[PDB]
Design an enzyme around this catalytic site. Structure first.
Site, PDB file in Angstrom:
ATOM      1  CD  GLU A 214      -5.410  -1.873  -6.291  1.00  0.00           C
ATOM      2  OE1 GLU A 214      -5.562  -1.290  -7.384  1.00  0.00           O
ATOM      3  OE2 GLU A 214      -6.078  -2.872  -5.953  1.00  0.00           O
TER       4      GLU A 214
ATOM      5  N   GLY B  42       0.890  -4.002  -6.419  1.00  0.00           N
ATOM      6  CA  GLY B  42       1.353  -3.079  -5.407  1.00  0.00           C
ATOM      7  C   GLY B  42       0.240  -2.592  -4.496  1.00  0.00           C
TER       8      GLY B  42
ATOM      9  CB  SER C 124      -3.834  -2.826 -13.632  1.00  0.00           C
ATOM     10  OG  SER C 124      -5.151  -2.840 -14.152  1.00  0.00           O
ATOM     11  CB  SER C 125      -0.821  -7.800 -13.732  1.00  0.00           C
ATOM     12  OG  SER C 125      -0.961  -9.206 -13.826  1.00  0.00           O
TER      13      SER C 125
ATOM     14  CB  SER D 167       1.656  -4.571 -15.086  1.00  0.00           C
ATOM     15  OG  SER D 167       0.403  -3.948 -14.862  1.00  0.00           O
ATOM     16  N   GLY D 168       3.636  -2.874 -17.037  1.00  0.00           N
ATOM     17  CA  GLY D 168       3.828  -1.977 -18.152  1.00  0.00           C
ATOM     18  C   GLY D 168       4.941  -0.968 -17.972  1.00  0.00           C
TER      19      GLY D 168
ATOM     20  CB  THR E 204       7.212  -7.885 -19.261  1.00  0.00           C
ATOM     21  OG1 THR E 204       7.413  -6.706 -20.049  1.00  0.00           O
ATOM     22  CG2 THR E 204       5.804  -7.871 -18.686  1.00  0.00           C
TER      23      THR E 204
ATOM     24  CG  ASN F 132      -1.047   0.111 -15.839  1.00  0.00           C
ATOM     25  OD1 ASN F 132      -1.012   0.636 -16.952  1.00  0.00           O
ATOM     26  ND2 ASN F 132      -0.314  -0.951 -15.527  1.00  0.00           N
TER      27      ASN F 132
END
Ligand SMILES: Nc1ncnc2c1ncn2[C@@H]1O[C@H](COP(=O)(O)OP(=O)(O)O)[C@@H](O)[C@H]1O
Ligand SMILES: Nc1ncnc2c1ncn2[C@@H]1O[C@H](COP(=O)(O)OP(=O)(O)O)[C@@H](O)[C@H]1O
Ligand SMILES: [Mg+2]
Ligand SMILES: [Mg+2]
Lengths: 183, 742, 183
Positions: free
Chosen positions: B445, B443, B220-221, B175-176, B180, B217
């Site tokens: 991680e 993912g 992070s989501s 994410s980031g 998005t 991150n």
């Protein structure tokens, strides 16, 4: 599948599925028979009232306890109790549910043998196991050591367990229980 | 190529430039890849193979020597800059890395990877996303079109329209990194082919309630966002349906030392809104609150103030009123004050009683409950036995676990209710015919301090990778039966499923962990001893840990598709328990606030209802993953991979270990490994004739005669009717003897 | 590198790295076996409690000393003691660490040979050496002459040494020790 935990006890039969926080069905272990004649025609009274139903008709029945002190003395009444528990209380078929049974220490071996024979033949339970009341009591108490005093309606006994190891030579059994207190 | 306007260069280079760049010096014998210390491998030329010693001159000028058993070929210039990795002559682990590296050097963002699609986010504006490309792209099939998201999107749309089955899109990335905006452009493309504004407006609400700061991150989501895009009967956009899955509850109570909690609590503690703080009686110091101060207090990830105001504005312009928003903030504040509860032992009993009650009083006042009733429920939970209610006893540990479980559960219910409200507001009255699913998931991680939360994510990613492997095997078998070239019918699933069977199945790691917490005297040493007894040597995946570069702790190591991962046992047993309290849930149902809606339904002729005590986070995780697999498997899947090029914001520069880690966690190495065991190289007979007939100057008989004179072994090739299959070594041999021929 | 100084003795195993002021790990040399059956399931009791752990479970274990009088009579138990010492008390792999061993004077040659064989084969130590328990005590006293009386738990012996030259013909060994006093 799921496992079934049945506790015959003495004076109270309590049962329910494994993984439950409390037994679903709790009722006295009483078999009653009508002692009078019966004059009304058409109702067709049954010849045996079993379980909590006998409490309602207590005034016209002779209540007989199938077990005196742990030992089963009236086997046919015990098939009736187990059939009632399995069908009219839990409404399950024991053909696909392993059954766990609870049994007091220092009892005749013929008792356990007949219990297992009845379970495997009459009800055709796929698998079963018999355990000691004190070990289960220590399980539920969140402990691994300590001496436990199990005093029901049938018999009072102490079983000392240390670090998950029992001390069979230190097990003491006393037949004084709730029934003698009532008498 | 004139159709693709001025955006063609990024989309695809011209044949003229390709041919100009084809001719450049390259010796296949001694310009092969060499291992390196700074990075995994570097481009270098080997002077000679002097036994077990070699001399390779890299671009940096080093003369390091390497062992002879780990040398391996480099791509010839005629196959460089290939669009599809599946057609690469030699499949090597960093060969894909270097191909992607020099493609991004010439700015080819989109690259085919067989069934995968690789997309690296550019740091500068590009004309590829201009809608003139979108309008004029229609009418091209996946095979002819150069790689891009529009190709797979149009393929999925055609499959939905003609094959009359659901299609799903699976994106993978951090994410980031542009996920998005990638989803925004994808839904814009869907709208063009026929509620993007509504999706963009509602995105910050989900982002603020589902993202948290981790070591890797800052944004992070965690939860598995999933959007279903519905269509009309005539193949026109109708509506959108959104769902959430696999939201983690352990983050609410237990946080790593260098990681934060969800952004919610920090955002509420913003000082720019004073009314909320004083009306909720919130302590302005984050240090005082116990649930928050355990983790890292604050980082410069995102300035929380205007983000909070933006979320508040998005809620305000949404369909519901401000009273619901105020209920949300007050409920969150109540969740905050659950850590201030304290309990102490009694006079001459093992029972526990509270000492302080001011925090209990204020929490009960906020929830609209009675403090005495709530305390009585926590200390003395009522339970139903047969036909009569009895009261149960609780010690300090059990009441703390119940307090944590209630806080996690109420947060889960709030998030689910918010998602339902958003879905209802987004809902249009159009009929819902076949849908196109979009799936976003965290993912694979990897940390040096892996724990239970990372274990669940890794297990979910491994299940997804197994699903992808099964799908690719099915596709390969379909192609084989189409071409009539059918061998090696062994399934590609069980090889990865061997590791799965040691997690979810009985006597697995998760099952033993779940059982152990039920035993009332369990400890970490006993749990480790049981794992060693039941899995060391008996299983083919469980093995001893490794101590590398002074890592803090390691207890056991598993093998996955991404390599060797070790986890830390310490702390797992305490946080696995989720014992809910029934009487407190009843009290919530009897409350005078909206909270009863969230806890409306919570916990004879056949029952398997697990008790409140018999509740583990792992069991809920497995159940949610299974119910997700019972839904995703019903649709034809498509895969999208996003790779960060560098750790820094600077465009062009790359971090080779970072790209290695991204490729490893994305499963591309597994894909190429599965492709390499069969016949990955497939060329048409006409192309083979126009390229390789010159070798024996003079169609089944001619091809057979040509191959019989090349000393090609029988088992190295498959002779088909449309395409002929070759092994990797055959292509290299043909390239070499063509080189000596010319 | 560093050298390990293990002192098996009898009834107390003490060990530590060379150059340290005092031994790092000191614990009794006993091996315990559970003499009961165990009723609680799922705990997974180990079949042998070794070292200082067995002192905390004295009530459900039988304790056997692997060394009677200097000599080793139960080699499996001694191997367990050595493995525990190397892998739990010190937490150091003996693959790259020499070991120095001690034993009493006038002991069977088979004992020393088997100790050496086990220590090179099972643990694969780079090197090892055996020293008399009395000469080391003479070193520790900062002396070079005089007699030393090493009265342990297994055996009591006297070794006269003058100016670093031992006198084998004057060594006296007595089997009375702390164990006999306890009995
Ligand atoms: N609150 C109470 N006070 C005193 N005696 C009780 C109480 N509740 C139950 N009992 C006694 O306990 C007996 C029930 O024992 P129970 O647990 O059923 O034994 P078992 O487990 O062997 O069946 C009853 O006969 C009753 O006399
Ligand atoms: N202060 C003391 N009083 C009485 N007995 C002791 C004292 N110190 C040690 N012991 C006895 O000595 C024995 C241990 O002697 P030790 O030198 O450890 O023998 P070894 O070297 O063979 O292990 C123990 O059994 C203990 O009973
Ligand atoms: Mg009882
Ligand atoms: Mg000694």
């Amino acid at each position: 599948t799921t496992a079934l935990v049945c506790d015959n006890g003495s004076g109270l039969v309590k049962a329910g599925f494994a993984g439950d926080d409390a037994p679903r069905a709790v009722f006295p272990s009483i078999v009653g028979r009508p002692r009078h004649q019966g004059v009304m025609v058409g109702m067709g009274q049954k010849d045996s009232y079993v379980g909590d139903e006998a409490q309602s008709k207590r005034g016209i029945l002779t209540l007989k306890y199938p077990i005196e002190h742990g030992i089963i003395t009236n086997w046919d009444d015990m098939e009736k109790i187990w059939h009632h528990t399995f069908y009219n209380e839990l409404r399950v078929a024991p053909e696909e549910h392993p059954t766990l049974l609870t049994e007091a220490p220092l009892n005749p071996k013929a008792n356990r043998e007949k219990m297992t024979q009845i379970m495997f033949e009459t009800f055709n339970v796929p698998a079963m196991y018999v355990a000691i009341q004190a070990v289960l009591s220590l399980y539920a108490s969140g402990r691994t050591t300590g001496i436990v005093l199990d005093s029901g309606d049938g018999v009072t006994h102490n079983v000392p367990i240390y670090e998950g190891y029992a001390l069979p030579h230190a097990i003491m059994r006393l037949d004084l229980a709730g029934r003698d207190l009532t008498d | 190529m004139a159709v693709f306007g001025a955006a063609a260069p990024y989309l695809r280079k011209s044949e003229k430039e390709r041919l100009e760049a084809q001719t450049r010096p390259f010796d296949l014998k001694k310009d092969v890849f060499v291992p390196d210390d700074k990075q995994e491998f570097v481009k270098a030329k080997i002077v000679s193979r002097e036994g077990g010693k070699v001399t390779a001159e890299t671009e940096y000028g080093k003369t390091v020597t390497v062992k002879e058993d780990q040398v391996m070929q480099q791509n010839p210039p005629k196959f460089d800059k290939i669009e599809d990795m599946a057609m690469l002559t030699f499949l090597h682990e960093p060969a894909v890395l270097y191909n992607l590296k020099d493609r991004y050097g010439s700015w080819m963002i989109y690259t085919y990877s067989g069934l995968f699609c690789v997309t690296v986010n550019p740091y500068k504006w590009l004309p590829v996303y201009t809608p003139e490309v979108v309008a004029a792209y229609r009418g091209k099939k996946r095979s002819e079109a150069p790689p891009h998201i529009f190709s797979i999107s149009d393929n999925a749309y055609q499959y939905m329209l003609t094959d009359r089955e659901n299609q799903s899109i699976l994106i993978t990335g951090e994410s980031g990194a542009g996920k998005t905006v990638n989803t925004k452009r994808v839904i814009q493309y869907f709208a063009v082919i026929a509620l993007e504004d509504q999706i963009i407006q509602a995105n910050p609400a989900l982002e603020a309630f589902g993202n948290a700061k981790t070591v890797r991150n800052d944004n992070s989501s965690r939860f598995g966002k999933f959007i279903r895009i519905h269509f009309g009967a005539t193949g026109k956009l109708a509506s959108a349906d959104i769902e959430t899955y696999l939201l983690e509850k352990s983050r609410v109570i237990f946080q790593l030392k260098a990681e934060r909690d969800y952004h919610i609590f920090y955002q509420i503690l913003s000082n720019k809104k004073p009314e909320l703080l004083d009306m909720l009686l919130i302590t302005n110091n984050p240090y005082d609150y116990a649930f928050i101060s355990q983790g890292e207090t604050t980082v410069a990830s995102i300035d929380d103030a205007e983000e909070l105001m933006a979320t508040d504005n998005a809620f305000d312009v949404l369909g519901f009123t401000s009273e619901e928003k105020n209920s949300m903030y007050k409920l969150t504040g109540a969740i905050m004050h659950f850590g201030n509860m304290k309990f102490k032992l009694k006079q001459r009993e093992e029972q526990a009683e509270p000492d302080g009650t001011e925090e209990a009083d204020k929490s009960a006042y906020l929830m609209g409950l009675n403090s005495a009733d709530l305390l009585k429920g926590l200390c003395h939970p009522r339970v139903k036995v047969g036909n009569e209610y009895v009261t149960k006893g609780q010690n300090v540990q059990q009441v703390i676990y119940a307090t944590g479980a209630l806080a996690k559960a109420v947060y889960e219910r709030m998030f689910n209710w918010m998602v339902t409200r958003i879905n209802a507001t987004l809902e249009t009255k159009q009929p819902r015919q076949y849908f196109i699913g979009v799936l976003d998931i965290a993912g694979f991680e990897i940390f040096d301090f892996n724990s239970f939360e990372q274990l669940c994510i890794n297990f979910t990613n491994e299940k997804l990778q197994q699903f992808f492997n099964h799908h690719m095997f099915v596709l390969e078998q379909e192609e084989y039966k189409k071409e009539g070239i059918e061998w090696t019918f062994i399934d590609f699933g069980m090889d990865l499923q061997a590791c799965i069977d040691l997690i979810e199945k009985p006597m697995g790691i998760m099952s033993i962990l779940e059982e152990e917490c039920m035993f009332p005297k369990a400890t970490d040493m006993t749990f480790k001893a049981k794992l060693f007894d039941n899995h060391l040597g008996k299983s083919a995946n469980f093995q001893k840990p490794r101590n590398i570069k002074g890592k803090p702790e390691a207890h056991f190591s598993l093998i996955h598709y991404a390599g060797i991962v070790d986890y830390n046992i310490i702390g797992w047993l305490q946080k696995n328990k989720d014992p809910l309290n029934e009487t407190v849930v009843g009290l919530y149902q009897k409350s005078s606030l909206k909270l009863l809606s969230t806890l409306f339904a919570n916990y004879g002729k056949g029952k398997a209802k697990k008790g409140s005590s018999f509740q583990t986070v792992s069991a809920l995780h497995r159940e949610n993953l299974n119910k997700l697999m019972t839904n995703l498997r019903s649709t034809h899947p498509h895969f999208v991979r996003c790779i960060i090029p560098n750790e820094t914001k600077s465009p062009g520069v790359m971090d080779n270990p970072l790209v290695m880690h991204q490729l490893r966690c994305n499963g591309v190495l597994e894909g190429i490994r599965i492709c390499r065991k069969g016949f990955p190289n497939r060329i048409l007979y006409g192309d083979f004739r126009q390229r390789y007939r010159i070798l024996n100057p003079a169609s089944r008989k001619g091809a057979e005669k040509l191959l019989s004179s090349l000393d090609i072994d029988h088992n190295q090739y498959k002779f088909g009717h449309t395409k002929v299959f070759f092994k990797a070594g055959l292509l290299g041999l043909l390239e070499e003897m063509r080189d000596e021929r010319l």
